[PDB]
Amino acid sequence: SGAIYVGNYRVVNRHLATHNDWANLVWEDSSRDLLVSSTTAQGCDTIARCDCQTGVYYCSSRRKHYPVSFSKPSLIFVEASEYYPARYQSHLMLAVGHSEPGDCGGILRCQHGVVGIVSTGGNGLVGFADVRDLLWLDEE
Numbered sequence: 001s002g003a004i005y006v007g008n009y010r011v012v013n014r015h016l017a018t019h020n021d022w023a024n025l026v027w028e029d030s031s032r033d034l035l036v037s038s039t040t041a042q043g044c045d046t047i048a049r050c051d052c053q054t055g056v057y058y059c060s061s062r063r064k065h066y067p068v069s070f071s072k073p074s075l076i077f078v079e080a081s082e083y084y085p086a087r088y089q090s091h092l093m094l095a096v097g098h099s100e101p102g103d104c105g106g107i108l109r110c111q112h113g114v115v116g117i118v119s120t121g122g123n124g125l126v127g128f129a130d131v132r133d134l135l136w137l138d139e140e
Ligand SMILES: CSc1ccccc1N(C)C(=O)N1CC[C@H](C(N)=O)C1
Pocket: 015, 033, 078, 079, 081, 082, 083, 084, 089, 099, 100, 101, 102, 103, 104, 118, 119, 120, 121, 122, 123
């Protein structure tokens, strides 16, 4: 589990969005596994606006933050799970690192701020849904 809190927005994995989230929807994209809901209080996370390919992510199944190198956002095939059939997920970045299903939502950060959240993984890999292209998260 986990979320990004920027301005009056809450960014979570779409497959983990609560009942409170769909009743306050701003934008969602199933192909990206992202959902953004509106919040009453202002958040303090800064979104990175960069092309970094190294950062640090939080891994809840190990209670540890790990430094990682990751690929640029791309269209990647993701196996079937209880949340989606087998499909291509877009804007996904992969790294070599530990992840278990409940690690989704952990933040990936670089020197510029938040890059994305854990969204996929297994077999010694971890995949992150990029949020750096969502420029509107910074305004209105
Ligand atoms: C860190 S995800 C993970 C970890 C280890 C094993 C498997 C996983 N997968 C694949 C997983 O449970 N999902 C649920 C939905 C998600 C998605 N974006 O499609 C992927």
